[PDB]
Amino acid sequence: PAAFSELSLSGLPGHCLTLLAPILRELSEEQDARWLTLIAPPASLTHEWLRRAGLNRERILLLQAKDNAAALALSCEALRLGRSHTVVSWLEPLSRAARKQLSRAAQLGQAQSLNIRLG
Amino acid sequence: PAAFSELSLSGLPGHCLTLLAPILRELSEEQDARWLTLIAPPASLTHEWLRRAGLNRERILLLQAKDNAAALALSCEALRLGRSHTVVSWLEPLSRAARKQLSRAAQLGQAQSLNIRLG
Amino acid sequence: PAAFSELSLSGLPGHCLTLLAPILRELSEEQDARWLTLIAPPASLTHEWLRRAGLNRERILLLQAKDNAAALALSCEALRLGRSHTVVSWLEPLSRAARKQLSRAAQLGQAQSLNIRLG
Amino acid sequence: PAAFSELSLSGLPGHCLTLLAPILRELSEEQDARWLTLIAPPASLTHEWLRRAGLNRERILLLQAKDNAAALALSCEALRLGRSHTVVSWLEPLSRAARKQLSRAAQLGQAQSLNIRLG
């Protein structure tokens, strides 16, 4: 769909995080004045991992969710209110429906939905 | 101030436009999914000039104003609403007050104010 | 396997290249004095795309291959002489066999095999 | 004058550089097979900044000057030699005299003089 894209990373759990950093970093220190919010990221993304990764720290919000369903909910709110240029999800599985939901929320907020499937 | 910047171009009126194109083009084809609105741009920026400057016409708004004061008004609304990542003004003169106004409007809309003084 | 990882990107062909730049860039301007070689990259990766994406062309080998099989061959040679810290493949499909081949080639050359599935 | 134009950028030192990149990038990829020479550019323009800004490095001549007067000298030679389509200066202050000097040097070499006032 529109305003939606999915990034899949397979290989050593560690090397996957490595491959991810540059992307997260590129988005955060981006030209936009809005935020890059991460939603329900996996345990791996430690408070330390982020700064070691070189987080734009001041411009990277990290919300927590309990349900792989609550996450799809937050992700949509985040996008919709559009105070984030990018909202990163770590949702799996992800129905063709769920996607359309993110897609619409993304377009309303004039934002981008990026879903990351680690492992 | 913050979220504010001014670009001044002096020299052959033609050159100036040439030097401007790359910037508008760059602003327009940017990563934040919101609009790039131009407010009360000078006559030069013809309907043709824009496409010839080959700018992504499906991400560019071009509002018109009658008063160099009405323009400062629109520019502030545009920024406030926050559906534009950048709102380009062509205001002169521009009081230290006026700037503060644009700066605040810009921060509320999580946007950028860019004022261009041609000539 | 080991020394192997796959990155999959789905969404607008354009926006996928965008998400890829940061990763290739980090890898190009790395520490390891060795080459970061790209093998049989899609047409998208223009001579221009590379410099526009801020890569460090002074540390990249962009080899061309005709067969999605010849690519798997070059990729293994490249890795094997371990003169490249990373060898990026754009192979699809990729048998569980092919992977093991890349994995071993990668370990011999003390390198990393990264396969990218665009689209 | 003729063959002369000045671009002034005010706001966050960083943003300003951002607004400049597009312009330099164009100039560097100009059709005119001749050189684009930058003269006494500010420290900001790091060896890295240039490649990160996607300028076609292979076509740039970055000459260094010690005096804001030596710069006006180099700038005039560069222009006067006829081997650069554009010669970018970072001179301030710049007398109405100095300009005329650049203007003539520019017309002799069939080139353009662009002076950039950062900050």
Curated annotation (Swiss-Prot), chains A, B, C, D:
Keywords per UniProt: Cell cycle, Cell division, DNA damage, Septation, SOS response
FtsZ binding as annotated region, ranges: 57-62, 64-66, 78-83
Oligomer and partners: Homodimer. Interacts with FtsZ.
Protein name: Cell division inhibitor SulA
Entry keyword annotation includes Thylakoid: no
Modifications after synthesis and translation: Is rapidly cleaved and degraded by the Lon protease once DNA damage is repaired.
Lineage, highest ranks first: Bacteria, Pseudomonadati, Pseudomonadota, Gammaproteobacteria, Pseudomonadales
Function field: Component of the SOS system and an inhibitor of cell division. Accumulation of SulA causes rapid cessation of cell division and the appearance of long, non-septate filaments. In the presence of GTP, binds a polymerization-competent form of FtsZ in a 1:1 ratio, thus inhibiting FtsZ polymerization and therefore preventing it from participating in the assembly of the Z ring. This mechanism prevents the premature segregation of damaged DNA to daughter cells during cell division.
Gene induction: By DNA damage, as part of the SOS response.
Similarity remark: Belongs to the SulA family.
Coiled coil location: none
Residues of the full protein shown: 43 to 161 of 161
Species for this entry: Pseudomonas aeruginosa (strain ATCC 15692 / DSM 22644 / CIP 104116 / JCM 14847 / LMG 12228 / 1C / PRS 101 / PAO1)
One annotated GO biological process: negative regulation of cell division
